[PDB]
Amino acid sequence: VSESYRRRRQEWELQYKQAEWEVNSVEQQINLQNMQIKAANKRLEQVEA
Amino acid sequence: QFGSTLLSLLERKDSLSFDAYQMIQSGDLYRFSIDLQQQDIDINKASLE
């Protein structure tokens, strides 16, 4: 039983750390979307002019 | 004959003035074009990251 709990912990550790990486990735998405917004604005400005 | 001759010259002039104005006017769009193209380059950099 003791060793079983140990393995369970190993699993939980790996699991959470992977989720952590994913949490980082979404930030990159946010940055990209902001740049995209900038571009859209430029397009409008171009049409306007 | 003199009057008609002169008239034709004014028609010429305004033609040229139109074309000149049009060309310089069109020259500005490149500004926006450059802006957005460069912006896309940066966006691709972020994607790479």
Short mmCIF file of C-alpha atoms in Angstrom, two decimals:
data_model
loop_
_atom_site.label_atom_id
_atom_site.label_comp_id
_atom_site.label_asym_id
_atom_site.label_seq_id
_atom_site.Cartn_x
_atom_site.Cartn_y
_atom_site.Cartn_z
CA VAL A 1 0.00 0.00 0.00
CA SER A 2 2.77 2.43 0.87
CA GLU A 3 4.48 1.99 -2.46
CA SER A 4 1.12 2.31 -4.18
CA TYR A 5 0.65 5.76 -2.71
CA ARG A 6 4.16 6.61 -3.80
CA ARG A 7 3.37 5.77 -7.41
CA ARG A 8 0.15 7.73 -7.16
CA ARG A 9 2.16 10.76 -6.16
CA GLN A 10 4.58 10.28 -9.04
CA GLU A 11 1.60 10.40 -11.32
CA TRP A 12 0.10 13.50 -9.75
CA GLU A 13 3.42 15.29 -10.03
CA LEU A 14 3.83 14.63 -13.72
CA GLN A 15 0.18 15.46 -14.34
CA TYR A 16 0.20 18.87 -12.71
CA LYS A 17 3.48 19.90 -14.26
CA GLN A 18 2.12 19.18 -17.72
CA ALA A 19 -0.96 21.24 -17.03
CA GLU A 20 1.39 24.00 -15.92
CA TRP A 21 3.08 24.03 -19.30
CA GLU A 22 -0.28 24.29 -21.02
CA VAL A 23 -1.13 27.25 -18.82
CA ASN A 24 1.97 28.89 -20.16
CA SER A 25 1.04 28.22 -23.78
CA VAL A 26 -2.23 30.08 -23.67
CA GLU A 27 -0.32 33.27 -22.86
CA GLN A 28 1.43 33.03 -26.19
CA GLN A 29 -1.96 32.79 -27.79
CA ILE A 30 -3.01 35.98 -26.04
CA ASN A 31 0.02 37.85 -27.32
CA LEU A 32 -0.64 36.70 -30.86
CA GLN A 33 -4.25 37.80 -30.66
CA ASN A 34 -3.19 41.25 -29.53
CA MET A 35 -0.86 41.58 -32.49
CA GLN A 36 -3.71 40.42 -34.69
CA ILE A 37 -5.94 43.14 -33.30
CA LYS A 38 -3.29 45.71 -34.14
CA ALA A 39 -3.20 44.44 -37.70
CA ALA A 40 -6.97 44.65 -38.05
CA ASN A 41 -6.84 48.23 -36.89
CA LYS A 42 -4.22 49.04 -39.49
CA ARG A 43 -6.44 47.52 -42.16
CA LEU A 44 -9.34 49.73 -41.18
CA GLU A 45 -7.08 52.77 -41.17
CA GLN A 46 -5.88 51.89 -44.64
CA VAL A 47 -9.38 51.53 -46.04
CA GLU A 48 -10.35 54.80 -44.41
CA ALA A 49 -7.44 56.71 -45.88
CA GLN B 1 -7.16 79.79 -84.69
CA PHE B 2 -5.18 81.26 -81.82
CA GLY B 3 -7.96 80.76 -79.32
CA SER B 4 -8.55 77.14 -80.25
CA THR B 5 -4.84 76.46 -80.19
CA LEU B 6 -4.46 77.80 -76.68
CA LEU B 7 -7.48 75.88 -75.45
CA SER B 8 -5.89 72.60 -76.44
CA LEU B 9 -2.86 73.49 -74.36
CA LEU B 10 -4.91 73.97 -71.25
CA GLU B 11 -6.54 70.62 -71.80
CA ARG B 12 -3.08 69.09 -71.99
CA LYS B 13 -1.99 70.81 -68.81
CA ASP B 14 -4.90 69.69 -66.68
CA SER B 15 -4.42 66.17 -67.98
CA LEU B 16 -0.85 66.09 -66.75
CA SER B 17 -1.74 67.72 -63.46
CA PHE B 18 -4.34 65.06 -62.87
CA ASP B 19 -1.96 62.23 -63.56
CA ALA B 20 0.72 63.72 -61.33
CA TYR B 21 -1.68 64.23 -58.46
CA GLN B 22 -3.03 60.73 -58.84
CA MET B 23 0.42 59.17 -58.80
CA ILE B 24 1.66 60.97 -55.72
CA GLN B 25 -1.65 60.26 -54.02
CA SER B 26 -1.33 56.56 -54.72
CA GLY B 27 2.21 56.59 -53.35
CA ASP B 28 0.94 56.84 -49.76
CA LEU B 29 -0.78 53.45 -49.49
CA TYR B 30 2.60 51.76 -49.31
CA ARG B 31 2.92 53.16 -45.81
CA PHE B 32 0.10 51.00 -44.48
CA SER B 33 1.22 48.13 -46.67
CA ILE B 34 4.67 48.13 -45.11
CA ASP B 35 3.25 48.44 -41.62
CA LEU B 36 1.03 45.41 -41.90
CA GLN B 37 3.60 43.26 -43.70
CA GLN B 38 6.19 43.87 -41.02
CA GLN B 39 3.57 43.23 -38.37
CA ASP B 40 2.97 39.81 -39.87
CA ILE B 41 6.66 39.07 -39.64
CA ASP B 42 6.61 39.79 -35.94
CA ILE B 43 3.53 37.62 -35.53
CA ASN B 44 5.38 34.73 -37.09
CA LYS B 45 8.24 35.29 -34.68
CA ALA B 46 5.86 34.93 -31.76
CA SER B 47 4.44 31.73 -33.26
CA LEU B 48 7.92 30.31 -33.51
CA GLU B 49 8.46 31.10 -29.86
#
